[PDB]
Paper text:
Contactins (CNTNs) are neural cell adhesion molecules that encode axon-target specificity during the patterning of the vertebrate visual and olfactory systems. Because CNTNs are tethered to the plasma membrane by a glycosylphosphatidylinositol anchor, they lack an intracellular region to communicate across the membrane. Instead, they form coreceptor complexes with distinct transmembrane proteins to transmit signals inside the cell. Finally, structural analyses of five CNTN–amyloid pairs indicate that these proteins interact through a conserved interface involving the second fibronectin type III repeat of CNTNs and the copper-binding domain of amyloid proteins.
Introducing the T751A and V752A mutations in chicken CNTN4 reduced its affinity for APP by fourfold, so we found it intriguing that these changes occur naturally in zebrafish CNTN4. We thus decided to gain structural insights into the zebrafish complexes to determine the extent to which details of interactions differed when compared with chicken CNTN4–APP. Finally, complex formation does not involve any substantial structural change in CNTN4, since the structure of the unbound FN2 domain in CNTN4 matches those of amyloid-bound CNTN4 closely.
Numbering used by the authors: 598 to 902
Write the structure that this text describes.
Amino acid sequence: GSPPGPPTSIHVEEITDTTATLSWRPGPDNHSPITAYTIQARTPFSLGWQAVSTVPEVVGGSHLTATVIELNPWVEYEFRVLASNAVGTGEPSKPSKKARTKDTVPKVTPANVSGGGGSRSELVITWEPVPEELQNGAGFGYVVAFRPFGSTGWMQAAVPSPEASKYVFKNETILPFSPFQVKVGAYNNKGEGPFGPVITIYSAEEEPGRAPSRLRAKSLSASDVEVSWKALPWSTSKKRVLGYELRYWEKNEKEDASSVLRTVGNRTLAIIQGLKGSSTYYITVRAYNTAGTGPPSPVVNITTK
């Protein structure tokens, strides 16, 4: 004997939200009785034909129908069937006419919810967009829920773009770097999915309001300058200074073309390297946090070498 021919006339008998019952006509067995049928599916969201699970778990050679299980709601599927005997597995059937599974409400929650930062008086929330095949119906979107820490009433923002990964709430009553409880869910035309777990997200900061003081520069060589300054006083974990930004430009160059060195943390000293000898540089220092830079120090000048 030889491997079986293709089965024919794959037909979708019934389709639900997660199953599809198929029928087919047997092809030639080529003198070795058919011992199994296997089904594969194709969708617009994955490359190529893929194995699927069935009831019964193994489709015997005397079965001309079976139910494909664990499909995703509101997805367009093609199916095809392969016949096997003791000799081998035959060529796949021609595919069934495309059919969409029924829709349901979203089941997953948006993954990897986070947030923070942003511009003045904003609250920035982020998440991983839900993959298309898990959206379960048309009209898919996100429900972003939030409330200032210590309050009861929730606010809900809808984000009707299935591709979106961020929502920015802007309101002037948000004090800087204020804690919010946040949770994110999905919805579609069939209804709402569940919210994920509640997490704490901080609103945007405000730029530091003080310039640093005591900016001094000392020439160490033809190319290196030691810059030191005094930290801003009274910075806290709530009104933060993350580091400082040094800007430096050569005399008779524009301030707009300045080089930039940033520190992170508490050390208010840095060496600027790579300079030209016997050359005068202007330097300023500013504090920064995630909202941006504060006012600059006065300009200090230093001549190398």
